[PDB]
Design a protein around this ligand. Structure first.
Ligand SMILES: Nc1nc2c(ncn2[C@@H]2O[C@H](COP(=O)(O)OP(=O)(O)O)[C@@H](O)[C@H]2O)c(=O)[nH]1
Ligand SMILES: Nc1nc2c(ncn2[C@@H]2O[C@H](COP(=O)(O)OP(=O)(O)O)[C@@H](O)[C@H]2O)c(=O)[nH]1
Ligand SMILES: [Mn+2]
Ligand SMILES: [Mn+2]
Lengths: 288, 373, 378, 288
């Protein structure tokens, strides 16, 4: 595992909202240690047995917290991430979709300089199989095993993990890094972490059109990785200049093309699966 | 969200960018009256959401009101690479001495906004990005401090722009203030022009807005419907779906942008040709699928519909129930092929028995099926 | 530059601060018409550039249009600690549950703008800070990032304000955007009010603008003349002079703010009582001194004029020449005492023979001379 | 001396302006080494034999520069100071009066973080007697001698220096730190420099109402100064809440009172002159 495990103590921002409350319940059932909640205006209340505070600072004054997961609505979400970083929370998981790009350009810069790691926005979160769930993913598709996952998408990720789990390979930590164009944590940021986790024997990179995180990740793998990596690219047939759902899934002329991503994987000796099943097949092969 | 040149110009002017006076015209008669008011040479410019309007013949100079009438007449209703011109901008013609390029976009590798500046204006800036990537000078802007006059002046000298240095730098400063001010994802002045009188002017302008920030720009949120590349984009938004019109005849519905792209990739690989992208969001209950069908079927080009959903927790009949509702309301007149992973896949199958809605266990299989339609 | 409450409110409203609807009245008739249009209880508030309008009786409630008329009548033209009320704001009265204090000023020790927030609103903040400084909470704002909602919320909790937390924070955020937006040197909402309905409203507002930034707020630069504490401030600005009206009868002209303060201190120490501060700027040529005399003499209270200049490079005859011109145009009707250090001071003395304009080598001497003299036209 | 001497090579920003032209000539007469000038729009021109460039960076590409003096008009002056600091110029003297406070709140922060020392704005500059003049002060009143001066005013400073010079005491480096509320260099910033300059045997602090730089300077002197310091406060009889010419010369309720400044000097064993002559008298006394 990386980043989080059963001991990770979790704060939920936006806990009183319909999304926050729904997923807080799910996380509680999974075994995640939700110790506190934050919603400005609702301090002093309680949600599913979890005490609620007006501010993150009050929350951490009564509870030790190692991570915060944010369900606050898009217009306020960047501000909520800033608040968590300024309260000293080391790991911040930003779920919310629809945050203005420039809000994130500003916030990512500030949060990183403060020493917090931001995952998101527009992401399903992070799960360490059979240890802790900090996000909105269905726990049942993540059997504990040997493969680490990093993905720019959600449901597609769950399908891969279900396949990996059915094949007896299993998963370690899965991180949904988000569908936005400006995000807190890229493939290349997480790769060194997986590289040094002995429980992770292989890493699957689920990417898609847009930007060049995949190419930069491939270059890093080529030079630094001491274990097999398998890639996958969504949107290989996509048109140019059109957002494909995800704010970040867009080809801008020369930048973010699927071809560039396939080419960079090959040059790095990273095999590219064409289908979910091929992901399982390529990982089996690389692991003997 | 795309804006027209005249809308981009209004925004730029509001932030202090000099702009030729201009007015939109819906008829040759309006174009003429406008030419008469200006009482000088004008340009008639097609207002459509593509570039290369000039090469395509959508930008014509007119020396007299009667010429303005005739040039509007020849442009209104013309086709420019797929789009129909429904309006034109009638602007005072500027006398051009120099054409420069100034543009702002997000650089995703640096997680910062980047100013791109070049002597080679009036031409495809991507063309120069190959012929000579060296002809494009870049400045990555500080997300908190912004872009200051001294930085703008240095960029002007770096790029070797001739003309009044202070006025050039001011345009660049205002360009960025406008970018941040309306949450643009793209703002370019091409060509940024030095007139024969030494004046600095934005002869053309392009702005694309960040859709995520429309909620804080009401005056611009209004334009959403009219600026849409396709009317179904708006409907789909109502339900929180993301729709994209593609050229093809297989309708696509999926839950998750990544999964939908994968679905498009599968279809394309096996000879198919998708009519659209439609992401219905994370969840896939009956109402959601019903609405998604509703939206997709309003597209004449759609021969049939491939629904590809991975529910996991969400039960599979939820999908079937929504498709059934649609069918027994006489909405569903085309064949529907599904791959629905999740709980109780069998009871979902014994819901679609006899009805023109067929399930498969694998996505590639379903994909192939829809190819023969 | 001072703004009136109604002007401060217009600015705050423009930036999203909730404000009671109101309109300015110049006559009891206009006050009544306004009361009628609102059709509810209103407040009649003197618009003058001081605080304590309430204790001084310039803020009166009025339940009916006829009372609005009467109260406008009682307030228009009243004197509030020196100032004459020439207009009133007629505003809808708010039902008050809570009175809080929110204010922004420059903290010169940190070189940053500081938000000051306190439960104890509706009261002279200066009192508070002196009495119990602990009731005032402070946040120093990042000059590039600004003041963000999360920082505003923390400040609300820190200060123990009761009321909708998000709406309180939003007012604070808007208050700062307004501050930066008009280059305020001061912006306070006192009292920031929670209504009995739970609403948040700026019941009063104060804004002082940075004069150095008027050039980029044309809108507000316009108000310069009317908002001036004294009409001579404007004239003096025309020449690039800084003028301040003081209560006293000795007119003061100097070259350099520091030197002019010193001059005021000298005069005061030796029994005198200065009528004004006037800094004519770095240089002191004939035209400059002439204009300075022109401006200072338009003040009825002036019995005589003490000119204290240190030219160094600049000739002393330059000063004399300017004073002579003024005298020889029948502008200079009062006695003028000078201390003019520089070059050719003797040549300058010779020039002032037979003129009611006397030089001295030392400033303290000149200072004493003017204090003892009965002034008045000669 | 401190900061500057005859070897200091000077750039003039705003050289083509009325003020820039006038004081460039004066500085040249004094012996100051003006090597280059900057005015956007006038690059390629020449002023009093000094080549003019469009930007500071072009200027320093052709000339070595140790200090820049800025005569640019108030609306553009902060930006000019930023340009100089970003060009790596170590000492920046900002003369211009009337710069918006908030321009300086921003600029001072950025310039300091870059490693440049900013003097000003709204200041007469800096002079090292008989070595170099970087400012608008009359050179004739600064005979070379034993006393260092730091002042918030201009003409008043010249009078003190003239008096110190006629008394045979003389001056080392005089620094006009400016009449603004937000400035680049305070008394306490320069005191350590004077403290360690053996040619400076005494320091005169000419202050006035407003803020608390004087009190902070006094506290530092008490604890660290190894030579005599004499104070002076303009505006002792000033009213409250009124700007006395200088944007920074204003008493804001409890802050910036003359009483507070006299009290703090007293507690630090810093004698306060009531008149120009008393400045000379107190310095004579302290110097045995
Ligand atoms: N002389 C002159 N030429 C113009 C004017 N406006 C546009 N043009 C020219 O027409 C070309 C096409 O116009 P533009 O608005 O840039 O259309 P685009 O093809 O979509 O980029 C420009 O590159 C200009 O050189 C004008 O006012 N005067
Ligand atoms: N009930 C009520 N009281 C008010 C209203 N407006 C002002 N006041 C009170 O009047 C006092 C002073 O008036 P204010 O507007 O603050 O002017 P000031 O005298 O310059 O402080 C405040 O302490 C308020 O409590 C109002 O609309 N309704
Ligand atoms: Mn163009
Ligand atoms: Mn008040």
């Amino acid at each position: 595992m990386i980043l989080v495990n059963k001991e990770t103590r979790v704060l939920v921002q936006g806990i009183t909202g319909r999304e926050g409350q729904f997923h807080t319940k799910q996380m509680l059932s999974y075994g995640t240690k939700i110790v506190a909640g934050v919603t400005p205006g609702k301090g002093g209340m309680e949600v599913l047995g979890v005490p609620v505070y007006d501010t993150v600072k009050e929350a951490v004054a009564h509870h030790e917290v190692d991570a915060s997961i944010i369900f606050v609505p898009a217009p306020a979400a960047a501000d909520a991430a800033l608040e968590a970083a300024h309260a000293g929370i080391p790991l911040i998981v930003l779920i919310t979709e629809g945050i203005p790009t420039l809000d994130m350009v500003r916030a990512v810069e500030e949060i990183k300089a403060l020493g917090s790691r931001l995952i998101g926005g527009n992401c399903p979160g992070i799960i360490s199989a059979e240890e802790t769930k900090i996000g909105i993913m269905p726990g049942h598709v993540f059997k504990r095993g040997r493969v680490g996952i990093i993905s720019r998408s959600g449901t597609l990720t769950y399908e891969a993990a279900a396949a990996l789990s059915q094949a007896g390979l299993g998963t370690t930590t899965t991180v949904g890094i988000g569908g936005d164009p400006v995000i807190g944590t890229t493939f290349k940021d997480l790769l060194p972490l997986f590289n040094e986790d002995p429980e992770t024997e292989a890493v699957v990179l689920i990417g898609e059109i847009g930007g060049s995180d995949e190419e930069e990740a491939a270059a890093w793998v080529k030079d630094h990785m001491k274990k097999p990596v398998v890639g996958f690219i969504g949107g290989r047939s996509a048109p140019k200049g059109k957002r494909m759902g995800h704010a970040g899934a867009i080809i801008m002329g020369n930048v973010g093309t699927p071809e560039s991503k396939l080419r960079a994987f090959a040059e790095a000796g990273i095999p590219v699966a064409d289908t979910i099943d091929e992901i399982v097949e390529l990982v089996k092969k690389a692991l003997g | 969200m795309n804006l027209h040149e005249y809308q981009a110009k209004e925004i730029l002017a509001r932030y202090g960018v000099p702009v030729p006076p201009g007015k939109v015209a819906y008829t040759p008669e309006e174009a003429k009256r406008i030419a008469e008011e200006f009482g000088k040479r004008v340009v008639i410019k097609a207002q459509v959401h593509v570039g290369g309007r000039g090469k395509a013949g959508g930008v014509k100079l007119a020396d007299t009101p009667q010429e303005a009438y005739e040039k509007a007449q020849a442009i209104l209703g013309m086709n420019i690479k797929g789009l129909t011109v429904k309006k034109v901008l009638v602007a005072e013609a500027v006398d051009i001495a120099k054409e420069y390029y100034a543009g702002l976009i997000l650089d995703r590798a640096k997680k910062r906004v980047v100013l791109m500046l070049s002597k080679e204006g009036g031409v495809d800036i991507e063309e120069v990005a190959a012929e000579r990537p060296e002809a494009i000078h870049k400045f990555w802007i500080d997300p908190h401090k912004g872009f200051r006059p001294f930085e703008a002046r240095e960029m002007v000298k770096r790029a070797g722009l001739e003309g009044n240095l202070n006025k050039l730098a001011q345009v660049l400063v205002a360009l960025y203030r406008a970018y941040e001010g309306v949450d643009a994802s793209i703002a370019e002045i091409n060509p940024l022009v030095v007139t024969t009188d030494g004046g600095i002017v934005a002869a053309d302008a392009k702005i694309v807005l960040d859709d995520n920030a429309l909620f804080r720009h009401p005056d611009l949120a209004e334009l959403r419907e009219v600026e849409a590349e396709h009317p179904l984009e708006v409907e789909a938004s109502n339900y929180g779906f993301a729709y994209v019109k593609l050229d093809g005849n297989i309708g696509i519905i999926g839950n998750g942008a990544g999964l939908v792209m994968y679905t498009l990739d599968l279809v394309n690989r096996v000879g198919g040709k998708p009519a659209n992208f439609l992401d219905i969001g994370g969840g896939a209950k009956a109402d959601v699928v019903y609405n998604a069908l509703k939206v997709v079927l309003k597209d004449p080009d759609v021969k049939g519909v491939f629904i590809n959903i991975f529910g996991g927790i969400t039960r599979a009949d939820e999908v079937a129930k929504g498709v059934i509702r649609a069918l027994e309301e006489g909405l569903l007149t085309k064949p529907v092929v599904m791959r629905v992973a999740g709980t109780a896949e069998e009871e979902a199958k014994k819901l679609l028995e006899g009805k023109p809605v067929y399930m498969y266990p694998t996505s590639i299989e379903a994909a192939k099926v829809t190819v023969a339609m």
